[PDB]
Amino acid sequence: DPVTDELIVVRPIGFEPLQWVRALAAEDPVPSDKHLTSAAVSVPGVLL
Amino acid sequence: PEFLPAVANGTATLTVDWHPERVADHTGVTATFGEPLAPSLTNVPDALV
């Protein structure tokens, strides 16, 4: 909760992965490859 | 109440700490261009703003 501002300096979309999973399951548009392969969303995504 | 800086006779003044790496993570947010280009090495004038 407290460090959301300094966290959101970096991330362009905001890292909601499970709704992206719902989108890919229901065949919705997906976030692009750069916004997926950036580190702040990749290194938690592979851990999850 | 008194956290915005005070207004003088005509002016409003501030003293701020400037770091050059904040220009780098400024350009990382702004410049989201295509493939073939690349950002510059010198600093851009829209960083003092």
Q: If you search the block for the tokens 């992965």, which residue do you land on?
A: A17
What does the DSSP 8-state code read for residue B43?
A: P
Count of CB atoms situated within 10 Å of the CB of A41:
20
- Quote the CA–CA distance of B45 and B37 in Å, as a whole number: 19
Residue A2, CA distances (Å) to A7, A8, B11 in order = 10, 12, 35
In DSSP terms, B12 is beta-bridged to B7
**Chain-chain contact of B25 with A9 (C-beta, under 8 angstroms):** yes
Contacts of B16-22 with C-beta under 8 Å, sequence gap 24+, read B22/B47
Residue of A nearest to B31 (CA): A12
Q: If you search the block for the tokens 């692009």, which residue do you land on?
A: A32
Q: Return residues 3-42 of A near B (CB < 8 Å).
A: 9-10, 12
Type of residue at A3 = V
Technique employed here was: cryo-EM
